[PDB]
Design a protein around this ligand. Structure first.
Ligand SMILES: N#Cc1cnn2c(=O)cc(Cc3ccccc3)[nH]c12
Ligand SMILES: N#Cc1cnn2c(=O)cc(Cc3ccccc3)[nH]c12
Ligand SMILES: *Cc1c(COP(=O)(O)O)cnc(C)c1O
Ligand SMILES: *Cc1c(COP(=O)(O)O)cnc(C)c1O
Ligand SMILES: [Cl-]
Ligand SMILES: [Cl-]
Ligand SMILES: [Cl-]
Ligand SMILES: [Cl-]
Lengths: 358, 356
């Protein structure tokens, strides 16, 4: 397996630049002037290219639409005061993208070439990256199969493309969650730990049920012991005093039903570095949370992920009865600290190797 | 709201493609006919259905069909009888299944009989692509996809329904049975025909090939239940532990795709009334024991593409189990094939066939 090369980039600037949006942006609805595109076939990878944001033209038998040979990434770029733009830990997104590619028998590529191409693309649309407090550029790489045939097999054609959305988003607002064991997001030996499109379509109906029932997100439970796995599209963390009397930050381990989040890892890294309390990757059950809540040992429950960064939870609707989560009562101190450090790093206030300059 | 066949627009092709040569083999799903059906949906409701030349789709880069697998499909066959009459096999069931799939993915509802008529109209237009050599047919592939130009994970406000056709052209297969592989789970979506269920199986199928097997026998649960064979339902014909001769296939408890061929085989066998016909869990342990006790007669997969597919070998981890399907006729398999053929090619008129 060869790889496309960033040296071979082909650039084509738009003939009529689009009018940028300070006003209300909906997430993922406004895109920039350009996009990256690379084609793969039996002759390997073609030359990458930046081109005006434009429609895909696909054979109607394309395996991307019949058998979900499709995977994506999500990461952010932040514009610092000094008008410099930085990507947050992009190497980890490239790492995960490649593992996802392998799981779906899609073509391998060089993580650094893709990153260089993405850098080049963001450079070209530098000015779309906003700089108002708490804003960023969302980067959405995608790799889809494109075999024009109905056989369920390893494709001999593929498209890799990348589009960009400017986004907005410090009054951290807590959410309520529906926790219903009938809905299972992922299973051991499945593909829940890869960022494949097939993992997301089925959750749309589940999220609608959570809205009809007065909740804002889904808390995905797993196992007959009802383990807390994820919140919506976010990893979940619990800050509590554990059954053994020790203050800790816990998140479920990567046993196959958890998507390894970049924010998740970064929160673990940060907490470990501070050395101020126990940081552990351990299974969390509803039984354990209820008991900890009845003994007042829970301080904060929250989600982590690129879009929200850190999202507090204040209520869980479980077994038809509502559980209050005292997250906001506790500051939320941990949440606020995490947000501030990430913000200082992301907007270049503290220099840090996690940031990748555009 | 629904599209109506009465409103169909027809655009005939100006560039007809050459039909498959007489000395050229039809590889499954690579050759398409000249026309396709196309129906779009948005906040205004369903647009007009069109039969139009086979052509590429134009998709926004953010299309939810490509990021969050808002996609489902179907698979059914049209058969040309000696009288040159083309007929669809139990299409109402595919239409039923397609709508359930759509509901599961918050994709727009449509009228089943309206789509069936549009599909009939489409096949009528391309009727000369329907082959007539024995064991040949026309594969019909309806597809419904969300098409929201937005990265939000939510109910799409636009969708695209299309149908394409492929002309398509009892030798036993070996199966890899390894509990490491899971196709579906209770509380998942294995019982719907959604694109997301198939992509993850490509690597597993490569693993079966590497290990010298032709298909994957999908196992589920601590007790290693036999669920499906590749993209087919699985059936076992044996003398059960209570000494009774039966045809068993797994029940529809969430991890099984309700196949049309499967339902048809249950219906036929129930009608005969010559042996016990049941839907029940089947475990590797039950199979292993029945094999050493010489109780297994035939094991086979069922599905639209193969109809009935015999199994001769199962590689369970490292044990190679011989399945005596072919040493037993295979009597039931042949019987099913013979009866299906009579119904499908119009030899014997039947309510299961829908005339085109
Ligand atoms: N973080 C976060 C978050 C909360 N809602 N939300 C959304 O509703 C959508 C996204 C984008 C996304 C991220 C990962 C997988 C699929 C889609 N992110 C988020
Ligand atoms: N029957 C059958 C059979 C055996 N192999 N096979 C294939 O390799 C492909 C198909 C078409 C199909 C059917 C259902 C889901 C996805 C694809 N069918 C079959
Ligand atoms: C993308 C994703 C996350 C979080 O990922 P980040 O890399 O932190 O943005 C968590 N859970 C699921 C299910 C996801 O798809
Ligand atoms: C389509 C399908 C079947 C069988 O379907 P028929 O309706 O009989 O063609 C069985 N299993 C799986 C996994 C399928 O996708
Ligand atoms: Cl990093
Ligand atoms: Cl992992
Ligand atoms: Cl019927
Ligand atoms: Cl069912």
């Amino acid at each position: 397996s060869s790889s496309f090369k960033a040296a071979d980039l082909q650039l084509e600037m738009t003939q009529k630049p689009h009018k940028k949006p300070g006003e209300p942006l909906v997430f993922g609805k406004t895109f920039t002037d350009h996009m990256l595109m690379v084609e793969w076939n039996d002759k390997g990878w073609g030359q990458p290219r930046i081109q005006p944001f434009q429609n895909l033209t696909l054979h109607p038998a394309s395996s991307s639409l019949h058998y979900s040979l499709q995977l994506f990434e999500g990461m952010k770029a932040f514009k610092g005061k000094d008008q410099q733009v930085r990507l947050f830990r992009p190497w980890l997104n490239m790492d995960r993208m490649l593992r996802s590619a392998m799981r779906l028998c899609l073509p391998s590529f060089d993580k650094l070439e893709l990153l260089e191409c993405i850098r080049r693309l963001i450079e070209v649309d530098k000015d779309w990256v906003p700089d108002a407090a708490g804003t960023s550029l969302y980067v959405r790489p995608v790799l889809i199969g494109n075999e024009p045939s109905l056989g369920v097999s390893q494709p001999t054609r593929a498209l890799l493309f990348v589009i960009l959305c400017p986004v907005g988003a410090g009054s951290v607002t807590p959410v309520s969650l529906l926790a219903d064991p009938a809905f299972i997001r992922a299973w051991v030996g499945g593909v829940g730990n890869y960022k494949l499109g097939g993992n997301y379509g089925p959750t749309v109906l589940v999220q609608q049920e959570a809205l009809k029932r007065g909740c804002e997100q889904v808390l995905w439970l797993y196992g007959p012991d009802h383990q807390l796995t994820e919140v919506g599209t976010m990893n979940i963390f619990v800050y509590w005093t554990h059954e053994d009397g020790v203050l800790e930050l816990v998140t479920p381990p990567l046993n196959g039903v958890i998507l390894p989040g970049v924010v998740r890892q970064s929160l673990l890294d940060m907490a470990q570095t501070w050395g101020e309390f126990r940081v552990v990757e351990r299974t969390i059950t509803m039984k354990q949370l209820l008991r900890a809540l009845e003994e007042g040992r829970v301080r904060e429950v929250f989600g982590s992920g690129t879009a929200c960064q850190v999202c507090p939870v204040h209520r869980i609707l479980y077994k038809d009865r509502n559980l209050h989560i005292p997250t906001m009562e506790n500051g939320p101190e941990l949440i606020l600290r995490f947000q501030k450090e990430l913000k200082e790093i992301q907007y270049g206030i503290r220099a840090h190797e996690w940031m990748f300059p555009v």
